[PDB]
């Protein structure tokens, strides 16, 4: 739209760097992932002990663009606290599951959606089976990583990941995506007697 909304959005993101909060928004593309890799290594340089509250809100994106986002969080020295606001995707909830154990939070009205990665194949007959092995390399590693995060077995992951599966925050505690739920205490509502 108009760049005045973009200018007032660029200001509040710049204030989030002072509170050690990074932003993952929109579709995970190749250029946006390079903007997020360079912003994670800078927050370690000012302090290598304080956590980074990662904001995750993405409706999808590329599979190899989010693969650079995944392994850059495990090798840095402080832990990354990941939160789910609004909606998680197949490349969004994989960022949610890649956080530190005991510091993965969520809101009770957000949606967690997980499925197998999409794509396509086109070309010669040898180009079909090679490109099919690329997606199955992305299929088996995401199912292998999710079994270590949630603690479930290998066969129960691929039975739910093969189709589009939505998850509730009440059942995400029992399944293993998020660890806790950050919310204010409710009001003392009187019953109907």
């Amino acid at each position: 739209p108009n760049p005045l909304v973009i200018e007032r959005f660029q200001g509040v993101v710049s204030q989030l760097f002072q509170q050690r909060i990074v932003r993952l928004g929109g579709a995970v593309d190749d250029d946006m992932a390079n903007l997020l890799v360079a912003q994670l290594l800078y927050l370690d340089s000012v302090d290598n002990k304080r956590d980074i509250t990662m904001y995750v809100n993405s409706p999808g994106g590329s599979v190899t663009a989010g693969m650079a986002v995944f392994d850059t969080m495990r090798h840095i020295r402080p832990d990354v606290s990941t939160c789910c606001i609004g909606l998680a995707a197949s490349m969004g909830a994989f960022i949610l599951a890649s956080g530190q154990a005991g510091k993965r939070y969520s809101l009770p009205n957000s949606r967690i959606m997980i499925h197998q990665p999409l794509g396509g194949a086109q070309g010669q007959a040898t180009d079909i089976e090679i490109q099919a092995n690329e997606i199955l390399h992305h299929k088996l590693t995401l199912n292998g990583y999710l079994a270590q995060f949630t603690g479930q077995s290998m066969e129960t992951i691929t039975k739910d990941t093969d189709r589009d599966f939505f998850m509730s925050p009440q059942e995400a505690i029992e399944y293993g995506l998020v660890d806790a739920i950050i919310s204010k205490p409710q009001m003392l509502q009187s019953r109907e007697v």
Binding site: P117, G120, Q122, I128, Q131, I135, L136, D162
Partner: protein
């Protein structure tokens, strides 16, 4: 009308249409004489191999192009694994036709099917896709038997 004559001159299409014309020519009780003009693609060489052995004629300017069929579509992760096993099975299915009609080994068909392999008029007779070089006399008897 104990023999049929179909001139083969096309650039080819899908591999599923070339299977049907090959299976239909090997089913009828009458004889099937196949003559090619120009080239014989993946949908056309199955009709060249679909004729009976002994009356497959190609001219001096005739070529022959053999290649593996293309395809593919967009979908989920496990959906590409199903059709990639199908393209590898169709590529083995057309290799059974080229090994039976030309009496070639199965491992040497897939080596030539891996790339776009072109053939001349001389090496098509040496491979087994045709029988002899066509001339005027092999088609002068065709146009005089169909008059009665």
């Amino acid at each position: 009308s104990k023999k049929v004559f179909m001139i083969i001159n096309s650039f080819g299409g899908s591999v599923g249409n070339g299977i049907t014309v090959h299976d239909a020519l090997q089913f009828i009780k009458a004889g099937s004489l196949t003559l090619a003009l120009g080239v014989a693609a993946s949908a056309a060489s199955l009709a060249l191999a679909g004729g009976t052995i002994g009356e497959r004629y190609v001219t001096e300017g005739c070529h022959t192009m053999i290649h593996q069929p293309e395809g593919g579509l967009n979908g989920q992760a496990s959906d590409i694994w199903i059709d990639s096993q199908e393209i590898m099975k169709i590529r083995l299915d057309v290799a059974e036709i080229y090994s039976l009609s030309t009496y070639r080994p199965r491992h040497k068909i897939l080596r030539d099917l891996d790339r776009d392999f072109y053939l001349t008029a001389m090496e098509t007779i040496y491979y087994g896709l045709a029988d002899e070089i066509a001339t005027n006399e092999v088609m002068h008897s065709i146009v005089e038997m169909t008059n009665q």
